[PDB]
Structures are given as structure tokens and as C-alpha cells.
Amino acid sequence: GTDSQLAQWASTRFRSFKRASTLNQQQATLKRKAPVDPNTAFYFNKDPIKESLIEMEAKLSKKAIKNFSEIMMWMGDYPIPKGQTASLVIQSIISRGIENHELRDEIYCQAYRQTNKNPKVESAKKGFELIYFLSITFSPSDSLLQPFMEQLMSRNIAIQSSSPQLASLIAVCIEKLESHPIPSYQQRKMGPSATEIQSFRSNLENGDISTCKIRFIDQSTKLAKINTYTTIREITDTVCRQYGISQQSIKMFGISAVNETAGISKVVSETDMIYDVLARWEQSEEKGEFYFQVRRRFFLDDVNKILDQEHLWTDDDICFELTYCQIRDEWMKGLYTNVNEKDSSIIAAILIQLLYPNQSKLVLTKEVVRQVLPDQILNSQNIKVWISMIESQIFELVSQTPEYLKLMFINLIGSKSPLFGCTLFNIQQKENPPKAWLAINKKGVSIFDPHTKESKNFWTFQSISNVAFTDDTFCIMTKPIKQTFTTDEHSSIASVYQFYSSQ
């Protein structure tokens, strides 16, 4: 008999209900045909809408028109152009909803309308999937919230018996709208990736737990449990526990986004949402595939005292092993070059004793030298000269345990490299060099020339009263002198700076 809560809400807001009222108020004018019925605006149509459903400003209506065609693309009722995909389409819709706040009710109404009296069940379900992905991001207005929920509840009651799967999908939408207001630290910034989409689908279909693949430095992997709101800090904690890193060491670890084809290894902020990162990777124009890699991020102990404070490094033997493995890998990638040929030959000698514990049985070859010296160092002399220099250092090497050789290797690298234990961020400067490295470690903040690896500036944590961030800068307050660096990595920089300075 009486109109639904949604229809009552739409009566004073929808174009179709308003135009019919202005035809009822000033009824003196002659009508051409019967009134088309204002409720038809709530029903599916194969054609793209020519104006927004809700009466609003023409600037907002124009964006609502483009949004409608995108909803149609997501639902498979409008084709997707050459350089686009379904994940990219829904990311656009949610982005429009995030930044155009007054377009939110209109997004929810367009999605819902397209689920009501749709001739294809494989289009209406996608319409409800979109409602789910909107409900995890932003709330509809306080005015629309209850009437819209009551409508979903009615559609659930009407389809419970015939379609219990589609009913579970509507029930999750209702759960996610009931969850609002979402706390600030949990508010998602991106729409879903094709990964998040598939995980959501197979969890409703099969009930199986969603996981994310995380690599370690040894190239081994771990599957971490992932939810809508999982942060990078939470996944780092879980994979590290799975690997066997002790409770106290877990805080020293972090995650980097690694792309091998396009040489990128970028720190991932511990406060980012893992699903927001996955969406950002889809949006990247970089060639190749990205993957997450656990790395030891923080180094609080003095590398110069490692041989006399072994327990600080070896008590957690899993953490020690991952640490040794990480420094060895950086050495093999040529990251440590503040080393002369004698120092490199000593390093090569230790690393050979670690690969071949039987000192007497050693036959030194070109192939053995390549396992322990990076090309960057090897380039400086003929490999035959390296064999001879390494053979000489091996004569000065006494029998040692594998653990002690790993500590000796770290001590040598650590003592000779000013970048050891630093987290590096690419920064832009008007000073020389224009493209520099912001280095943050246990001592403070530095600026390093990437070419020479020479430190241009250094500020201890004691000498910095406060820090500040903008969307494109990092600022340190150092007597009042402000030092500013161009970078968009405020989130990762704040986490690294807070950790080290707070000690």
C-alpha cells in the first residue's frame, strides 16, 4: 500500500518525483500522454542515463552521467575500451565517490537501480558487488543510510528462498553499512584490485580464507591472511611470526614493493592498507610485475661492536640468518662500494669459507670468485688477479664457526660503509646533486650523493626539534633553521623517522 522508506526519501530528491509534483502543483497545463510513473527511475534500463537520478547542480550531474556508464561497464551492460579493465573501472567509480562527496547518494542509487528488474542475473549480482565495494569505502548520507538499508533488507527477504548465495551478498552489504562510521585509520583510499575482487568472490562462493603471497630475501614465500582493512604492519607481523622471527625482533622488519623488470624497490608504509597498495600497483604505468618482500628495516645495534656484542645479533638465530642473507645479497648486488681491493679480497675470503667449510679441500676458480664478489667490484681487476689476491687472504684466515664468519662479514661491510643500516628515500633538491638520497638511520638524517655515495649533509636526532610533512615535502626543524626535501613518501618517511628518533 504505502511507499517504501527509499521511495519516501526519493520523493523530495529524485528528478522523476520532483517533475511529477511540479506537474501536479501546476496541473493547469494540458498533458500529452499518461504520466510515465516516477518509480521507473528505480528500475534497470539498457540505455545510459542522460541526466543524474537526483536533482543537483549541473557540474555534479555531468560527473554522475560519466559514472553511470562506468557502473554499466562494471556490470557488463556497456563495453570497456581498449586500454581498460573491470578493476580499473570500479577503481574510477570509488575514486569519484571518495573525492566527490556530494555524489555519494547518487552513486548508491545508480548501482541499486541497475540491480532492480535486470533481465540478467549475471549483471544484477555485479551491481550488488559494487554496493559491497562502495559500503567498505564510504557511507551514503545519514538521510539515505536507513531507507537504503531497509530496501536491501527487503530485497534480501524477497530473494532469500530462491537465491541464498545472492542473499548472502546482500546480507554482507547490509553488514558493511551497519559498520559505519568507520574509524579514520581504517578508511580505505582506493577501490578494489582484480586480486581483491577475486578473493572476495571465492570467499563468498567457497568460504576459503583470503591470503597474500609475501617473499623473503632467501626467495622463500609465506601466505599471509588478508582482510579488507589489513595494514602493511599487520601482514609484516603475521609473515614474520610464520617464518619464526621472535616476538622482540618483528618490529625491526618491514616490507618493500619490488619490481625486477623496472628496477624498483620502494619502502611500503606500515600504515598503508595492503589492498590500497595492490590497487596502486594496477594503476602503475611501470613495466613488469611488483611483489612484496620482507626486509630487515631497522638496525639499532652498533655494527662497529658486533664481534664484542654477538648476542644482540645472534640471540634470534632466524632474524640473524635473514640479516646475514640480506647484507650478503646487497654486497652481491654491488650496493657496498666504499671498499678497496684488499678489503674486498678479505670479504671474498670469508664468504668462500662460508660456502666451503673444509679449508684444506679448497680449489679456487673463476666460478668460486663469481659467487662472492659483485660485478661492480670485480670490474676493477682481471679475475686472475682477484684469484691471486683472494688466495693470499685465505692464508690469513684461521678456522672459525659459520656463525662467527657471518659476524666477521657483517663487521667488515658495516665498518666500511656509511650507508650500512640506513633507510634510503629518493629526494629532489635545487642544491647539488639535484637527484639525491635522504638517509635515515639510528644517528639521524643525512643527504647522500647517489653517484659518489658521499654524505653532503648530516643532522643528529638531538639537533632536530620537530618534523613536518606536505603531500610533496619532508621538513626537519633544526637557533631556528628549516630544512626541506622534495618527496611524496611522507608516510614511509614518518614511520622510519619516528622509529629511530624515538629511541
Coordinates of C-alpha atoms in Angstrom, one line a residue:
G1 CA 0.0 0.0 0.0
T2 CA 2.3 2.8 1.3
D3 CA 5.6 3.6 -0.5
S4 CA 8.9 2.1 0.8
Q5 CA 11.4 4.1 3.0
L6 CA 13.7 4.5 -0.1
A7 CA 10.8 5.8 -2.3
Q8 CA 9.7 8.3 0.5
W9 CA 13.4 9.6 0.6
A10 CA 13.5 9.8 -3.2
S11 CA 10.0 11.6 -3.3
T12 CA 11.6 15.0 -2.4
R13 CA 15.1 14.4 -4.1
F14 CA 14.8 12.4 -7.4
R15 CA 14.2 14.3 -10.6
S16 CA 11.3 12.0 -11.7
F17 CA 9.4 12.5 -8.4
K18 CA 10.0 16.3 -8.4
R19 CA 8.9 16.9 -12.1
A20 CA 5.7 14.8 -11.5
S21 CA 5.0 17.0 -8.4
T22 CA 5.5 20.3 -10.4
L23 CA 3.0 18.7 -12.9
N24 CA 0.6 18.0 -10.0
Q25 CA 1.0 21.5 -8.4
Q26 CA 0.5 23.5 -11.7
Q27 CA -1.9 21.0 -13.3
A28 CA -3.5 23.8 -15.5
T29 CA -1.2 22.7 -18.5
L30 CA -2.6 20.1 -20.9
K31 CA -0.8 16.7 -20.8
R32 CA 0.3 14.8 -24.0
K33 CA 0.3 11.2 -22.6
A34 CA -0.2 9.5 -19.3
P35 CA 2.5 10.3 -16.6
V36 CA 5.4 7.8 -17.2
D37 CA 5.4 6.9 -13.3
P38 CA 8.3 8.4 -11.1
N39 CA 9.1 4.9 -9.6
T40 CA 10.5 3.8 -13.1
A41 CA 13.8 5.7 -12.1
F42 CA 14.4 2.8 -9.6
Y43 CA 14.4 0.2 -12.4
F44 CA 17.1 -1.2 -14.7
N45 CA 17.5 0.2 -18.3
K46 CA 19.9 -0.9 -21.0
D47 CA 20.4 2.8 -22.1
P48 CA 22.9 5.2 -20.4
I49 CA 21.0 8.0 -18.4
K50 CA 21.0 11.5 -20.0
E51 CA 21.0 13.3 -16.6
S52 CA 21.6 12.4 -12.9
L53 CA 18.9 10.5 -10.9
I54 CA 19.0 13.0 -8.0
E55 CA 18.2 16.7 -8.7
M56 CA 21.5 18.5 -8.2
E57 CA 23.9 21.2 -9.7
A58 CA 24.8 20.6 -13.4
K59 CA 28.6 20.3 -12.6
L60 CA 27.7 17.2 -10.4
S61 CA 25.1 15.8 -12.9
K62 CA 27.8 15.7 -15.7
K63 CA 30.1 13.6 -13.4
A64 CA 27.0 11.4 -12.5
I65 CA 26.4 10.7 -16.3
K66 CA 30.0 9.5 -16.8
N67 CA 29.7 7.5 -13.5
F68 CA 26.6 5.7 -14.8
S69 CA 28.3 4.5 -18.0
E70 CA 31.1 3.2 -15.7
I71 CA 28.7 1.3 -13.5
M72 CA 27.3 -0.2 -16.8
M73 CA 30.8 -1.2 -17.8
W74 CA 31.4 -2.9 -14.4
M75 CA 28.0 -4.7 -14.7
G76 CA 28.8 -5.8 -18.3
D77 CA 25.9 -3.8 -19.9
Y78 CA 28.3 -1.3 -21.7
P79 CA 31.6 -2.2 -23.4
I80 CA 35.0 -1.4 -21.9
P81 CA 37.5 0.4 -24.2
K82 CA 40.9 -1.0 -25.4
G83 CA 43.1 0.3 -22.5
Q84 CA 40.7 -0.5 -19.6
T85 CA 39.6 -3.4 -17.3
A86 CA 36.8 -4.1 -14.8
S87 CA 39.1 -3.5 -11.8
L88 CA 40.2 -0.1 -13.3
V89 CA 36.5 0.8 -14.0
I90 CA 35.4 0.2 -10.4
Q91 CA 38.5 2.0 -9.0
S92 CA 37.4 5.1 -11.1
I93 CA 33.8 4.8 -9.6
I94 CA 35.1 4.6 -6.0
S95 CA 37.7 7.3 -6.6
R96 CA 34.8 9.6 -7.9
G97 CA 32.8 8.7 -4.7
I98 CA 35.8 9.4 -2.4
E99 CA 36.7 12.9 -3.8
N100 CA 33.2 14.0 -4.9
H101 CA 31.5 13.7 -1.5
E102 CA 28.1 15.1 -2.7
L103 CA 27.9 12.4 -5.4
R104 CA 27.8 9.5 -2.9
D105 CA 24.0 9.1 -2.6
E106 CA 23.8 9.3 -6.4
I107 CA 26.4 6.5 -6.8
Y108 CA 24.5 4.2 -4.4
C109 CA 21.1 4.9 -6.2
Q110 CA 22.6 4.3 -9.7
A111 CA 24.2 1.0 -8.6
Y112 CA 20.9 -0.2 -6.8
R113 CA 18.6 0.9 -9.7
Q114 CA 20.6 -1.2 -12.1
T115 CA 20.1 -4.3 -9.8
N116 CA 16.3 -3.9 -9.7
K117 CA 14.4 -5.7 -12.6
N118 CA 17.6 -6.6 -14.5
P119 CA 17.0 -9.2 -17.3
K120 CA 20.4 -10.8 -16.5
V121 CA 21.2 -12.3 -13.1
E122 CA 25.0 -12.1 -14.1
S123 CA 24.7 -8.3 -14.3
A124 CA 22.4 -7.7 -11.1
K125 CA 24.9 -9.7 -8.9
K126 CA 27.8 -7.4 -10.2
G127 CA 25.6 -4.4 -9.2
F128 CA 25.4 -5.8 -5.7
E129 CA 29.3 -6.4 -5.7
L130 CA 29.7 -2.7 -6.5
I131 CA 27.4 -1.9 -3.5
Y132 CA 29.7 -4.0 -1.3
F133 CA 32.8 -2.2 -2.6
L134 CA 31.1 1.2 -2.0
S135 CA 30.0 0.2 1.5
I136 CA 33.6 -0.8 2.5
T137 CA 34.8 2.7 1.4
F138 CA 32.3 5.5 2.3
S139 CA 28.9 5.8 3.8
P140 CA 25.8 7.1 2.0
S141 CA 24.3 10.3 3.6
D142 CA 22.8 10.0 7.1
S143 CA 19.4 10.7 5.4
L144 CA 19.9 7.8 2.8
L145 CA 21.5 5.3 5.2
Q146 CA 18.4 3.8 7.0
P147 CA 16.0 3.9 4.0
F148 CA 18.7 2.3 1.7
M149 CA 19.4 -0.5 4.2
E150 CA 15.7 -1.2 4.7
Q151 CA 15.4 -1.6 0.9
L152 CA 18.4 -4.1 0.8
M153 CA 16.8 -5.9 3.7
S154 CA 13.5 -6.1 1.6
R155 CA 15.4 -7.4 -1.5
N156 CA 17.1 -10.0 0.8
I157 CA 13.7 -11.2 2.2
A158 CA 12.3 -11.3 -1.4
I159 CA 15.2 -13.4 -2.7
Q160 CA 16.3 -15.5 0.4
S161 CA 14.4 -18.7 -0.7
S162 CA 15.1 -18.6 -4.4
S163 CA 18.8 -17.3 -4.4
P164 CA 20.5 -17.9 -0.9
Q165 CA 24.0 -17.1 -2.4
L166 CA 22.8 -13.7 -3.9
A167 CA 21.1 -13.3 -0.4
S168 CA 24.5 -13.7 1.4
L169 CA 26.0 -11.0 -0.9
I170 CA 23.1 -8.6 0.0
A171 CA 23.5 -9.5 3.7
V172 CA 27.3 -8.6 3.6
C173 CA 26.3 -5.2 2.0
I174 CA 23.9 -4.7 5.0
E175 CA 26.7 -5.7 7.5
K176 CA 29.2 -3.2 5.9
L177 CA 26.6 -0.3 6.0
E178 CA 25.8 -1.2 9.7
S179 CA 29.6 -0.9 10.4
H180 CA 29.6 2.9 9.7
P181 CA 31.1 5.2 11.0
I182 CA 34.5 3.5 10.0
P183 CA 37.5 4.9 12.1
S184 CA 39.9 7.3 10.3
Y185 CA 42.8 4.7 10.4
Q186 CA 40.6 2.1 8.7
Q187 CA 39.2 4.3 5.9
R188 CA 40.2 2.8 2.5
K189 CA 41.8 5.1 -0.1
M190 CA 41.4 3.0 -3.2
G191 CA 38.8 0.9 -5.0
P192 CA 39.5 -2.9 -5.4
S193 CA 42.3 -4.5 -7.4
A194 CA 41.5 -7.5 -9.6
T195 CA 43.1 -9.5 -6.7
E196 CA 40.7 -8.1 -4.1
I197 CA 37.8 -8.7 -6.5
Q198 CA 38.7 -12.5 -7.0
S199 CA 39.4 -13.0 -3.3
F200 CA 36.0 -11.5 -2.4
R201 CA 34.2 -13.7 -5.0
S202 CA 35.9 -17.0 -4.0
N203 CA 35.4 -16.3 -0.2
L204 CA 31.6 -15.9 -0.8
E205 CA 31.4 -18.9 -3.2
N206 CA 33.8 -21.3 -1.4
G207 CA 34.3 -19.8 2.0
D208 CA 38.1 -20.1 1.8
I209 CA 40.4 -17.7 3.6
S210 CA 42.0 -14.8 1.5
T211 CA 45.8 -14.8 1.6
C212 CA 48.6 -12.6 0.1
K213 CA 52.0 -14.1 -1.1
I214 CA 55.0 -12.5 0.7
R215 CA 58.6 -13.2 -0.3
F216 CA 61.7 -13.2 1.9
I217 CA 65.3 -12.5 0.9
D218 CA 66.1 -16.2 0.5
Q219 CA 63.4 -16.3 -2.2
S220 CA 61.1 -18.5 0.0
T221 CA 57.5 -17.3 0.4
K222 CA 54.7 -17.2 3.1
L223 CA 51.0 -16.9 2.7
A224 CA 49.5 -14.2 5.0
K225 CA 45.9 -13.9 6.0
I226 CA 44.4 -10.7 4.4
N227 CA 41.1 -8.9 5.2
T228 CA 39.6 -5.6 3.7
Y229 CA 41.3 -3.4 6.3
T230 CA 44.6 -5.2 6.8
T231 CA 47.5 -2.8 7.2
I232 CA 51.1 -3.5 6.0
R233 CA 52.2 -3.5 9.7
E234 CA 49.7 -6.4 10.5
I235 CA 50.8 -8.5 7.5
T236 CA 54.6 -7.9 8.3
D237 CA 53.8 -9.1 11.9
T238 CA 52.0 -12.3 10.7
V239 CA 54.5 -13.4 8.0
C240 CA 57.4 -12.8 10.4
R241 CA 55.7 -14.9 13.1
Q242 CA 55.1 -17.7 10.4
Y243 CA 58.8 -17.5 9.4
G244 CA 59.9 -18.0 13.0
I245 CA 61.2 -14.4 13.8
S246 CA 61.0 -13.9 17.6
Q247 CA 58.4 -11.5 19.1
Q248 CA 61.0 -8.9 20.0
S249 CA 62.6 -8.8 16.5
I250 CA 59.4 -8.4 14.5
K251 CA 59.5 -4.6 14.9
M252 CA 62.8 -4.4 13.1
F253 CA 61.2 -5.8 9.9
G254 CA 59.2 -4.1 7.2
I255 CA 58.0 -4.6 3.6
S256 CA 59.2 -3.3 0.2
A257 CA 57.4 -3.3 -3.2
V258 CA 59.8 -4.9 -5.6
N259 CA 59.7 -4.7 -9.5
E260 CA 62.6 -6.6 -11.1
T261 CA 61.9 -5.6 -14.8
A262 CA 61.8 -1.9 -13.9
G263 CA 64.5 -1.8 -11.1
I264 CA 62.2 -0.6 -8.2
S265 CA 62.4 -1.5 -4.5
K266 CA 60.3 1.0 -2.6
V267 CA 59.6 1.0 1.1
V268 CA 55.8 0.3 1.8
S269 CA 54.4 2.4 4.7
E270 CA 53.4 0.2 7.6
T271 CA 50.2 2.4 7.9
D272 CA 49.1 1.7 4.3
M273 CA 46.2 -0.7 3.6
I274 CA 47.5 -3.7 1.7
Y275 CA 44.5 -3.6 -0.7
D276 CA 45.1 0.1 -1.4
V277 CA 48.7 -0.8 -2.4
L278 CA 47.5 -3.6 -4.7
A279 CA 45.1 -1.2 -6.4
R280 CA 48.0 1.4 -6.8
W281 CA 50.1 -1.4 -8.5
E282 CA 47.3 -1.9 -11.1
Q283 CA 47.3 1.9 -11.7
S284 CA 51.2 1.9 -12.2
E285 CA 52.4 2.5 -15.8
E286 CA 55.7 0.7 -14.9
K287 CA 56.7 -2.3 -17.0
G288 CA 56.6 -5.8 -15.2
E289 CA 55.2 -7.3 -12.0
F290 CA 55.5 -6.0 -8.4
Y291 CA 55.8 -8.3 -5.4
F292 CA 56.1 -7.7 -1.6
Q293 CA 59.4 -8.6 0.1
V294 CA 60.1 -8.7 3.9
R295 CA 63.3 -6.9 4.7
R296 CA 65.1 -6.1 7.9
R297 CA 64.3 -2.4 8.1
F298 CA 65.8 -1.2 11.4
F299 CA 69.4 -1.6 12.8
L300 CA 69.6 -0.3 16.4
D301 CA 72.8 -2.1 17.5
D302 CA 76.3 -0.7 16.8
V303 CA 77.9 -2.7 13.8
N304 CA 81.3 -1.5 15.0
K305 CA 80.9 -3.5 18.2
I306 CA 79.2 -6.6 16.6
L307 CA 82.2 -9.0 17.4
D308 CA 82.1 -8.0 21.1
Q309 CA 78.2 -7.9 21.4
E310 CA 77.3 -11.0 19.4
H311 CA 74.1 -11.8 21.4
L312 CA 72.4 -8.6 20.2
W313 CA 72.7 -10.1 16.7
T314 CA 72.6 -13.9 17.2
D315 CA 70.1 -14.5 20.1
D316 CA 67.3 -14.6 17.5
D317 CA 69.0 -17.0 15.0
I318 CA 66.2 -16.8 12.4
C319 CA 66.5 -13.0 12.4
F320 CA 70.3 -13.3 12.3
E321 CA 70.1 -15.6 9.3
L322 CA 67.7 -13.2 7.4
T323 CA 70.0 -10.3 8.3
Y324 CA 73.2 -12.1 7.1
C325 CA 71.3 -13.2 3.9
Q326 CA 70.1 -9.5 3.3
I327 CA 73.6 -7.9 3.7
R328 CA 75.2 -10.7 1.6
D329 CA 72.6 -10.0 -1.2
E330 CA 73.2 -6.2 -1.1
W331 CA 77.0 -6.9 -1.2
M332 CA 76.4 -9.3 -4.3
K333 CA 74.2 -6.5 -6.0
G334 CA 77.1 -4.1 -5.7
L335 CA 75.5 -1.8 -3.1
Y336 CA 78.6 -1.6 -0.9
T337 CA 81.5 0.0 -2.9
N338 CA 83.3 2.2 -0.2
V339 CA 85.8 -0.7 -0.2
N340 CA 89.3 -1.1 -1.6
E341 CA 90.6 -4.3 -3.4
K342 CA 92.3 -5.7 -0.2
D343 CA 89.1 -5.2 1.8
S344 CA 87.1 -6.9 -1.0
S345 CA 89.5 -9.8 -1.1
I346 CA 89.1 -10.3 2.7
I347 CA 85.3 -10.2 2.2
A348 CA 85.6 -12.7 -0.7
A349 CA 87.8 -15.0 1.6
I350 CA 85.3 -15.0 4.4
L351 CA 82.3 -15.7 2.1
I352 CA 84.3 -18.6 0.4
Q353 CA 84.9 -20.1 3.9
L354 CA 81.1 -19.9 4.5
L355 CA 80.4 -21.7 1.2
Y356 CA 83.1 -24.3 1.6
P357 CA 83.7 -25.0 5.4
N358 CA 86.5 -27.6 4.5
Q359 CA 89.6 -25.3 4.2
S360 CA 92.0 -28.0 3.0
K361 CA 89.8 -29.2 0.1
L362 CA 89.5 -25.7 -1.5
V363 CA 90.2 -25.4 -5.2
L364 CA 89.9 -21.7 -6.1
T365 CA 88.4 -21.0 -9.5
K366 CA 86.8 -18.1 -11.5
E367 CA 83.4 -19.8 -10.7
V368 CA 84.1 -19.6 -6.9
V369 CA 85.1 -15.9 -7.2
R370 CA 81.8 -15.0 -9.0
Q371 CA 79.8 -16.5 -6.1
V372 CA 81.4 -13.9 -3.6
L373 CA 82.3 -10.7 -5.5
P374 CA 79.7 -8.4 -7.2
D375 CA 80.5 -7.4 -10.9
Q376 CA 80.9 -3.7 -9.8
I377 CA 84.0 -4.6 -7.6
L378 CA 85.2 -7.4 -10.0
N379 CA 85.4 -4.8 -12.8
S380 CA 88.4 -3.1 -11.3
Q381 CA 90.9 -6.0 -11.9
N382 CA 91.3 -9.1 -14.1
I383 CA 89.6 -12.1 -12.3
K384 CA 93.0 -13.9 -12.4
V385 CA 94.4 -11.1 -10.2
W386 CA 91.3 -11.4 -7.9
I387 CA 92.0 -15.2 -7.6
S388 CA 95.6 -14.4 -6.5
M389 CA 94.6 -11.6 -4.0
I390 CA 91.8 -13.8 -2.5
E391 CA 94.3 -16.8 -2.3
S392 CA 96.6 -14.5 -0.2
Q393 CA 93.8 -13.5 2.3
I394 CA 92.7 -17.2 2.6
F395 CA 96.3 -17.9 4.0
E396 CA 95.5 -15.3 6.8
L397 CA 92.1 -17.0 7.7
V398 CA 92.0 -19.3 10.7
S399 CA 89.3 -21.9 11.4
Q400 CA 86.1 -20.2 12.6
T401 CA 82.5 -21.4 13.1
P402 CA 79.9 -20.4 10.4
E403 CA 78.1 -18.0 12.9
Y404 CA 81.4 -16.3 13.6
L405 CA 82.2 -15.9 9.9
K406 CA 78.8 -14.3 9.3
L407 CA 79.5 -11.8 12.2
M408 CA 83.0 -11.1 10.7
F409 CA 81.5 -10.4 7.2
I410 CA 78.9 -8.0 8.7
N411 CA 81.6 -6.3 10.8
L412 CA 83.7 -5.7 7.7
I413 CA 80.8 -4.4 5.5
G414 CA 79.4 -2.4 8.4
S415 CA 82.7 -0.6 9.4
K416 CA 83.5 0.4 5.8
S417 CA 80.1 1.5 4.5
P418 CA 78.4 4.8 5.7
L419 CA 75.1 3.7 4.1
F420 CA 75.0 0.5 6.3
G421 CA 71.9 0.5 8.5
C422 CA 70.3 3.5 6.5
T423 CA 66.8 3.5 5.1
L424 CA 67.1 5.4 1.7
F425 CA 64.5 7.6 0.0
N426 CA 64.9 9.3 -3.4
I427 CA 64.6 13.1 -3.0
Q428 CA 64.7 16.1 -5.4
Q429 CA 66.8 19.2 -4.5
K430 CA 67.6 22.6 -6.0
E431 CA 71.1 22.1 -4.4
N432 CA 73.9 19.7 -5.8
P433 CA 73.1 16.9 -6.6
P434 CA 69.5 17.7 -7.8
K435 CA 68.5 13.9 -7.5
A436 CA 69.8 12.8 -4.0
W437 CA 69.2 10.2 -1.3
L438 CA 67.6 11.0 2.1
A439 CA 69.2 8.6 4.5
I440 CA 67.6 7.9 7.9
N441 CA 69.4 5.7 10.5
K442 CA 70.0 5.3 14.2
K443 CA 72.1 8.5 14.4
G444 CA 69.9 10.9 12.3
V445 CA 69.1 12.3 8.9
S446 CA 71.6 12.6 6.0
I447 CA 71.7 13.6 2.4
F448 CA 73.9 11.4 0.2
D449 CA 75.1 11.9 -3.5
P450 CA 73.9 8.6 -5.2
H451 CA 76.9 8.6 -7.6
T452 CA 79.9 9.1 -5.2
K453 CA 77.9 7.8 -2.1
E454 CA 79.4 10.9 -0.3
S455 CA 77.4 12.4 2.6
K456 CA 76.6 16.1 1.8
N457 CA 74.6 16.8 5.0
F458 CA 74.1 15.3 8.4
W459 CA 71.7 16.2 11.3
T460 CA 71.6 14.2 14.5
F461 CA 68.2 13.4 16.0
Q462 CA 69.2 15.6 19.1
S463 CA 69.6 18.6 16.8
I464 CA 66.0 18.2 15.3
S465 CA 63.2 19.7 17.4
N466 CA 60.4 18.6 15.1
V467 CA 59.4 17.4 11.6
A468 CA 56.6 18.3 9.2
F469 CA 55.1 16.8 6.1
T470 CA 53.2 18.0 3.0
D471 CA 51.9 15.9 0.0
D472 CA 55.2 16.6 -1.8
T473 CA 57.8 17.5 1.0
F474 CA 59.5 16.3 4.2
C475 CA 60.7 19.1 6.6
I476 CA 63.1 19.0 9.7
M477 CA 63.2 21.8 12.2
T478 CA 66.9 22.2 13.3
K479 CA 68.7 28.5 16.6
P480 CA 65.7 28.3 14.0
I481 CA 66.6 26.7 10.6
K482 CA 64.0 24.8 8.5
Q483 CA 65.4 22.1 6.1
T484 CA 63.0 20.8 3.3
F485 CA 63.3 17.9 0.9
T486 CA 61.0 17.2 -2.1
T487 CA 59.4 13.7 -1.9
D488 CA 55.9 12.2 -1.9
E489 CA 56.9 9.5 0.6
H490 CA 55.6 11.3 3.7
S491 CA 54.0 8.2 5.1
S492 CA 57.1 5.8 4.9
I493 CA 59.4 8.7 6.0
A494 CA 57.3 9.5 9.1
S495 CA 57.3 5.8 10.1
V496 CA 61.1 5.4 9.7
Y497 CA 61.9 8.8 11.3
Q498 CA 59.5 8.1 14.3
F499 CA 61.1 4.7 14.9
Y500 CA 64.7 5.8 15.0
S501 CA 64.2 9.2 16.7
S502 CA 62.0 7.8 19.5
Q503 CA 64.9 5.6 20.8

